[PDB]
């Protein structure tokens, strides 16, 4: 069970009418831990955590401010290289971070950039593991965060499911299975019919707004053979697989 | 060059007339960042809307979540109104109380 800590980076160019901007985000798994904008005075750190009383986000803050100011000198010269005339607006997005874990022993450092939504070469590989260089405090800062917010981070929130019927004019009903409250965003929602998997409409998993997630699976069933259908819910937070046959 | 978004309108919880909640509009799979999403109430644009910080998917496509607390009513009709520099005109998705 390893954990992640990736930083996001969005820089936008403002052609000769001021300057470009940016805004980085900090994610420790499926949780937003940090936020920071152009010329802001300090990054936004999740309250739930143990909140810096001497918590070395001073480390993070330094790195982000000096690393975030590498848009106006990474974008600009990137709009200059490509010669897309520095008249329109263009964007570059930087992303780093790792996926550590001690007891399993192993690191992994990440770093790729994209110009106007296209992968640019960085020459460094990808599985290149790891330990004035944020690439050295990755696993460290990571093993700190988990200690500041062990209630959300080290936390597996199970889903609450419930189906819903919508018998339509034509004579066909549509059965939809819902999955709410869960953390993390990995879940495997399926619809079947006597053990057989219906090889079914649905939605990408989406944010509820507080930390939990949502999603639903759907099929148009002939109103009469709807008791032979069932929906399974599997998540890391559940003790045993879920087989809700229309909510009983 | 210009990815166009995927609009969805939902509720943070099962909608029940007469109870506090949250109305979400999730926009994603779009690029450039320049977006403009409004939440409507019976055709009228709600005044106070909140939004999440701009993060970008694994494929460089930007995603945002806009919201606001609200108290669903069986008669009141809500919707999301979105505009991108790719669309020839504002698109409108109507919220389903059963989606």
Task: Give an overview of the whole structure.
The complex is a heterodimer of chains A (about 250) and B (about 100). Chain A contains 3 helices and 16 strands. Chain A is mostly beta strands. Chain A has a 7-stranded antiparallel beta sheet, with helices on one face. In chain A, strand 3 and strand 4 form a beta hairpin. The two termini of chain A are about 35 Å apart. Chain B has one domain: Immunoglobulin-like. Chain B contains no helices and 10 strands. Chain B has strands spanning about 5-10, 20-30, 35-40, 45, 50, 55, 60-65, 70, 80-85, 90-95. The interface between A and B is medium-sized, with 30 and 27 residues.
Report the β-strand fraction of chain B as a percent range.
over 45%
- Helix and strand content put the structural class of chain A at mainly beta
When the domains of chain B are counted, the total is: 1
Order of helices and strands of chain B: EEEEEEEEEE
Coarse morphology of chain B = globular
The CATH homologous superfamily of the largest domain in chain A is termed MHC class I-like antigen recognition-like
List strands and helices in order, with pairings:
The complex is a heterodimer of chains A (248) and B (99).
Chain A: E1 3-12, E2 21-27, E3 32-37, E4 44-45, H1 57-68, H2 76-81, E5 91-100, E6 109-115, E7 119-120, H3 138-148, E8 160-164, E9 172-180, E10 190-193, E11 201-202, E12 206-207, E13 213-214, E14 216-222, E15 229-233, E16 242-244
Antiparallel strand pairs in A: 1-2, 1-5, 2-3, 3-4, 5-6, 6-7, 8-9, 9-14, 10-15, 11-14, 12-13, 15-16
Chain B: E1 6-11, E2 21-30, E3 36-41, E4 44-45, E5 50-51, E6 55-56, E7 62-67, E8 69-70, E9 78-83, E10 91-94
Antiparallel strand pairs in B: 1-2, 2-7, 2-8, 3-4, 3-9, 5-7, 6-7, 9-10
């Amino acid at each position: 069970g390893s954990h992640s800590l990736r930083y996001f980076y969005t820089a936008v160019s403002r052609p000769g009418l001021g300057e470009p901007w940016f805004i980085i985000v900090g994610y420790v798994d499926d949780m937003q831990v940090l936020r920071f904008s152009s010329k802001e005075e300090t990054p936004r750190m999740a309250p739930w955590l143990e909140q810096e009383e001497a918590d070395d986000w001073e480390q993070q803050t330094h790195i982000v401010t000096i690393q975030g100011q590498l848009s106006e000198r990474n974008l600009m010269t990137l709009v200059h290289f490509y010669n897309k005339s520095m008249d329109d607006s263009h964007t570059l997005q930087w992303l780093q971070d790792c996926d550590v874990e001690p007891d399993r022993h192993l690191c992994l450092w990440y770093n790729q950039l994209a110009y106007d939504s296209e992968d640019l070469p960085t020459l460094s590989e990808n599985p290149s593991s790891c330990t004035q260089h944020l690439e050295g405090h990755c696993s460290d800062v990571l093993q700190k965060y988990l200690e500041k917010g062990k209630e959300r981070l080290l936390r597996s929130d199970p889903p609450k499911a419930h189906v819903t019927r919508h018998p339509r004019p034509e004579g066909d009903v549509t059965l939809r299975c819902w999955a709410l409250g869960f953390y993390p965003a990995d879940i495997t929602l399926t619809w079947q019919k006597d053990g057989e998997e219906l090889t079914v409409e649905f939605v990408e998993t989406r944010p509820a707004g507080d930390g939990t997630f949502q999603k639903w699976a759907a099929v148009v069933v002939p109103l009469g053979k709807v008791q032979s259908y069932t929906c399974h819910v599997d998540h890391e937070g559940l003790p045993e697989p879920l087989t809700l046959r229309w909510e009983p | 060059i210009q990815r166009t978004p995927k609009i969805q309108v939902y509720s943070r919880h099962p909608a029940e007339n007469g109870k506090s909640n949250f109305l979400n509009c999730y926009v994603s799979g779009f690029h450039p960042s320049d977006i403009e999403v409004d939440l409507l109430k019976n055709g009228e644009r709600i005044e106070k809307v909140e939004h999440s910080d701009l993060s970008f998917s694994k494929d460089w496509s930007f995603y945002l979540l806009y919201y606001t607390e609200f108290t669903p009513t069986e008669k009141d009709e809500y919707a999301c109104r979105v505009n991108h520099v790719t669309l020839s005109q504002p698109k409108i998705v109507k919220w389903d109380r059963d989606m």
